[PDB]
Amino acid sequence: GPLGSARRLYVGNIPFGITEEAMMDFFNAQMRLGGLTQAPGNPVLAVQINQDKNFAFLEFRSVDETTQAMAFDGIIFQGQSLKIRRPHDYQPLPGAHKLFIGGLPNYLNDDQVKELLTSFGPLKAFNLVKDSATGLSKGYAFCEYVDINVTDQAIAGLNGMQLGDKKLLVQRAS
Amino acid sequence: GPLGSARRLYVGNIPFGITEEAMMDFFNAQMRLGGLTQAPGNPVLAVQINQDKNFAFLEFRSVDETTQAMAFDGIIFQGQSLKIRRPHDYQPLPGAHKLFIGGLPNYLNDDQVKELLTSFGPLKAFNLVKDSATGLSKGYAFCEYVDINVTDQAIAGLNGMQLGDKKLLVQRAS
């Protein structure tokens, strides 16, 4: 990015020998049947297939329809479950999926707290709030995952859960 | 490779002395008469004749027109009723015998990985997946054998094989 790749999606596991036209027709028909289209006409403008590596890139007419179409992840097309993803180049804007982690033992250092979070996936940002004059923990931290799909996995696996004699709070910071 | 047999048909009970060009003219004429063509021009691209055993193969320009010509089973040519069938190696579900190969050492290149595979027989398709930014192997590959009946002999031979430091996964890609 920062503003790049907003109107394309990766589609993996496409059926063998399928055409660009046929894939286009399929996605345009689903957008309509599922009520995800936001104006009259076709949301998908073009499809590019790599037949050797069995994947496609769809290009959409709008930003919001690209986002809506991700709800089709897993849809079966000619026997095949399609893998729908953002382009590698796509990044959300900074602080969009920042997490607050509260209810931590205050005797734990930074690497020890990071350990629990990186079990779900890699981090692109982390800070453990400390009393700068003494250096000691305040019992809470902030972080952001490299993969934004992991955010809800960390919340689901850590929020409301027992850690020592204290219960964690894990939620979006804003 | 796989769809190659999706564009041909076996023809039996052919009349004595018939040429490849004569067979070609008859089938093109029949397809145009029935309106079974998808475009202008001639659907049959080539015919091969075995005159000793009285059969031919026809090759078509498309998968859909091949399926259509199947409706000519029993049609009369030079007083004789022709038998039209699929090749014995026709794949009705295409891509069914495509294999995934996982757990490869990441230093191995395309030719080294094929060498492991071609001990069981000739391949029709192969690709090793690489990171496009560095050109470095991601450690998995895909393939298909020319003879699909070798597929399960390769899975039996290769699946779970300790390959240096790693253990191979070899299965149908799905």
From Swiss-Prot, chains A, B:
GO molecular function terms listed in the Swiss-Prot or TrEMBL record: C2H2 zinc finger domain binding; enzyme binding; molecular function inhibitor activity; poly-pyrimidine tract binding; pre-mRNA 3'-splice site binding; RNA binding
GO BP term, pick one: spliceosomal complex assembly
**Where in or outside the cell is it found?**
Nucleus
Record-level GO cellular component terms: commitment complex; nuclear speck; nucleoplasm; nucleus; spliceosomal complex; U2-type prespliceosome; U2AF complex
What are the entry keywords? Acetylation, Disease variant, Hydroxylation, Intellectual disability, Isopeptide bond, mRNA processing, mRNA splicing, Nucleus, Phosphoprotein, Repeat, Repressor, RNA-binding, Spliceosome, Ubl conjugation
Positions modified as Phosphoserine?
S132
Q: Which residues carry this modification: 5-hydroxylysine?
A: K114
Q: Which residues form the RRM domain?
A: 7-89, 97-174
Superkingdom of source: Eukaryota
Primary localization class, coarse: nucleus
Summarizing the function annotation, the protein's role is:
Plays a role in pre-mRNA splicing and 3'-end processing. By recruiting PRPF19 and the PRP19C/Prp19 complex/NTC/Nineteen complex to the RNA polymerase II C-terminal domain (CTD), and thereby pre-mRNA, may couple transcription to splicing. Induces cardiac troponin-T (TNNT2) pre-mRNA exon inclusion in muscle. Regulates the TNNT2 exon 5 inclusion through competition with MBNL1. Binds preferentially to a single-stranded structure within the polypyrimidine tract of TNNT2 intron 4 during spliceosome assembly.
Q: Which family does it belong to?
A: Belongs to the splicing factor SR family.
Disorder:
Developmental delay, dysmorphic facies, and brain anomalies: An autosomal dominant disorder characterized by global developmental delay with intellectual disability and speech delay, epilepsy, hypotonia, short stature, microcephaly, intermittent exotropia, and non-specific facial dysmorphism. Brain imaging shows a thin corpus callosum and/or delayed myelination.
Per UniProt, subunit arrangement is: Interacts with U2AF1L4. Heterodimer with U2AF1. Binds unphosphorylated SF1. Interacts with SCAF11 and SNW1. Interacts with ZRSR2/U2AF1-RS2. Interacts with RBM17. Interacts with PRPF19; the interaction is direct. Interacts with POLR2A (via the C-terminal domain); recruits PRPF19 and the Prp19 complex to the pre-mRNA. Interacts with KHDC4 (Isoform 2). Interacts with ZRSR2. Interacts with the SF3B complex composed of SF3B1, SF3B2, SF3B3, SF3B4, SF3B5, SF3B6 and PHF5A.
Q: What is this protein called?
A: Splicing factor U2AF 65 kDa subunit
Gene name? U2AF2
Residue span relative to the full protein: 148 to 336 of 475
